[PDB]
Amino acid sequence: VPLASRAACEALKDGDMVWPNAATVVEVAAWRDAAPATASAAALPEHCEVSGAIAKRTGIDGYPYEIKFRLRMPAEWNGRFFMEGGSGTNGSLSAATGSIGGGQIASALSRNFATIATDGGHDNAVNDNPDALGTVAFGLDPQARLDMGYNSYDQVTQAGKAAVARFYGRAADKSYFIGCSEGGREGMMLSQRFPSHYDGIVAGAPGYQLPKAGISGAWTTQSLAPAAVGLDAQGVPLINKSFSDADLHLLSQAILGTCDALDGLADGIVDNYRACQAAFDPATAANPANGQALQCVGAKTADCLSPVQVTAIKRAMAGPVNSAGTPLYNRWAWDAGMSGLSGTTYNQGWRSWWLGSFNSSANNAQRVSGFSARSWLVDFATPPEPMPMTQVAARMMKFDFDIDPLKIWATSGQFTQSSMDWHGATSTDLAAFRDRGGKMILYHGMSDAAFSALDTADYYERLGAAMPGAAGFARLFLVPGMNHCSGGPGTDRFDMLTPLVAWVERGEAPDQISAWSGTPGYFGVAARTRPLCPYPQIARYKGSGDINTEANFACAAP
Numbered sequence: 144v145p146l147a148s149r150a151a152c153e154a155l156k157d158g159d160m161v162w163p164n165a166a167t168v169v170e171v172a173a174w175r176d177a178a179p180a181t182a183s184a185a186a187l188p189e190h191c192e193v194s195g196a197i198a199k200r201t202g203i204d205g206y207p208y209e210i211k212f213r214l215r216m217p218a219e220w221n222g223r224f225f226m227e228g229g230s231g232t233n234g235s236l237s238a239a240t241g242s243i244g245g246g247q248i249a250s251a252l253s254r255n256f257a258t259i260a261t262d263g264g265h266d267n268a269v270n271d272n273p274d275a276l277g278t279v280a281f282g283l284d285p286q287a288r289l290d291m292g293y294n295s296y297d298q299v300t301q302a303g304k305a306a307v308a309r310f311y312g313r314a315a316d317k318s319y320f321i322g323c324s325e326g327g328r329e330g331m332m333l334s335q336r337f338p339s340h341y342d343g344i345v346a347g348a349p350g351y352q353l354p355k356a357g358i359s360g361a362w363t364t365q366s367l368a369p370a371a372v373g374l375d376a377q378g379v380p381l382i383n384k385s386f387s388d389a390d391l392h393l394l395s396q397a398i399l400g401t402c403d404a405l406d407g408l409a410d411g412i413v414d415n416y417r418a419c420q421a422a423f424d425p426a427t428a429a430n431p432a433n434g435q436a437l438q439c440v441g442a443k444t445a446d447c448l449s450p451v452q453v454t455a456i457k458r459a460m461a462g463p464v465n466s467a468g469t470p471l472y473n474r475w476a477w478d479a480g481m482s483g484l485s486g487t488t489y490n491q492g493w494r495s496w497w498l499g500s501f502n503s504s505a506n507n508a509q510r511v512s513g514f515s516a517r518s519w520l521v522d523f524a525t526p527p528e529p530m531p532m533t534q535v536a537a538r539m540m541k542f543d544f545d546i547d548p549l550k551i552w553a554t555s556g557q558f559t560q561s562s563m564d565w566h567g568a569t570s571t572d573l574a575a576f577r578d579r580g581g582k583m584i585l586y587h588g589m590s591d592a593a594f595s596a597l598d599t600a601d602y603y604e605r606l607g608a609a610m611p612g613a614a615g616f617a618r619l620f621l622v623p624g625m626n627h628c629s630g631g632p633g634t635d636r637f638d639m640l641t642p643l644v645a646w647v648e649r650g651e652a653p654d655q656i657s658a659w660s661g662t663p664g665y666f667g668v669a670a671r672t673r674p675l676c677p678y679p680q681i682a683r684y685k686g687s688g689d690i691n692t693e694a695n696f697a698c699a700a701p
């Protein structure tokens with residue numbers, strides 16, 4: 144009977160707890176001792192851990208499906224509920240201590256939140272079909288698609304909040320959600336489709352048009368193929384051979400040559416991203432090291448990009464169009480984090496998406512033959528298109544930009560919703576969310592090759608147009624030099640949760656968000672802190688003091 148006790152915890156297992164979904168099966172209800180801090184994680188307080196599943200069933204593919212959850216409820220509780228977002232194609236159940244992203248030591252459980260996580264409705268250990276491209280195989284089941292898109296996060300939010308009410312005898316005062324990439328998509332989905340589920344939302348590098356990522360992948364694959372060298376085991380050009388690491392570093396150094404000082408300070412960071420896009424063209428830019436053109440006049444040298452390379456990358460970066468010339472996704476910003484050198488190690492965080500590792504005999508780019516290309520085929524194309532894994536790269540090379548893009552909007556047979564219907568989160572109708580007090584912090588690294596930061600910026604402009612005064616409840620924080628969710632030559636680490644709570648609960652909007660670099664070696668310094676600035680502002684050096692110190696910077700126009 145006593146609230147927030149071992150006894151209250153074990154009583155959750157099964158029968159006096161009423162779950163919102165009748166098909167909820169608790170498998171674990173265990174009391175956990177406080178855990179000390181480690182070098183990489185903050186101390187976790189004493190808490191109840193509950194795990195189990197919702198809606199166990201058999202899919203039309205004959206496979207088992209269920210929505211797994213793990214919930215942790217501290218004995219000493221700050222009254223707040225927290226859910227972390229997913230990543231990739233989901234399918235795994237995390238420790239559910241409430242990750243807050245941004246490379247942070249603290250978890251939400253370490254801050255005395257009750258924390259929940261889900262696997263999204265499928266299980267990479269079970270829903271792994273060798274004939275349906277592996278752990279993307281859940282896409283063969285219509286309901287599993289719906290669970291991946293929106294239904295799992297809905298079910299698990301409701302289950303968590305009911306358990307919180309039972310365990311503590313009181314409903315959560317506020318609820319918070321934090322996710323990056325696929326978890327960023329989840330957060331935008333929540334603000335649009337379930338506006339009262341969460342009071343504060345952080346959505347980092349959000350895949351809010353994830354079904355179009357494969358379209359961009361086909362495009363970047365085909366755009367880069369002319370500059371490839373060699374073929375793989377099934378005759379596909381080695382896209383990874385199109386640019387060596389030194390070649391990409393050359394390109395980022397040219398970008399810096401053109402763009403670094405456009406914010407007023409030569410420091411290896413392009414804060415003025417808009418001015419950079421208007422000024423930089425690989426075909427007209429100079430290599431700063433030797434005042435010559437970046438594009439070769441003669442044969443290929445180490446200080447030089449070949450004409451086909453420059454053409455390939457310009458076309459990749461422009462984004463896909465169909466035969467009518469219609470943009471299918473968006474363009475991508477030139478930025479210094481496409482490469483970067485720290486010590487003797489070249490940044491791999493940009494090139495792994497479209498190119499893959501140079502020192503390989505096979506293709507391995509996420510968008511050529513990796514999980515992104517596989518996920519489009521099975522998860523987002525309706526009629527799913529399962530095939531052997533060795534055919535995926537060829538399928539991207541043969542992708543038809545008039546025919547195939549239609550498949551993310553199509554229904555067929557028992558696939559009664561399109562992948563844009565269930566996975567997309569493109570709505571700018573956030574009024575219900577704003578008007579109950581909701582706040583949303585978006586962020587995106589500029590050298591993200593999974594999702595275009597410019598496309599997030601375009602969503603935010605549309606939001607601002609649809610909802611005048613939107614900066615009162617939603618702000619976007621672009622991070623120069625940052626790659627996908629983390630890494631790269633930028634200030635990629637930050638505590639988003641503290642400003643989010645301040646906004647929701649005190650009405651204190653973030654006019655800036657402190658950040659620091661996880662690899663300050665990209666700049667040859669020991670540390671670098673900078674403000675992140677709300678769109679469309681950028682960080683501006685005040686003219687004196689340490690260039691690596693955030694206090695000497697302010698947020699302003701470019």
Ligand SMILES: O=C(O)c1ccc(C(=O)NCCO)cc1
Binds near residue numbers: 515
């Ligand atoms: O299908 C894709 O293209 C794609 C899907 C999910 C992610 C993601 O969530 N990344 C997590 C890394 O933090 C990235 C790309």
Ligand SMILES: [Ca+2]
Binds near residue numbers: 408414
């Ligand atoms: Ca600069």
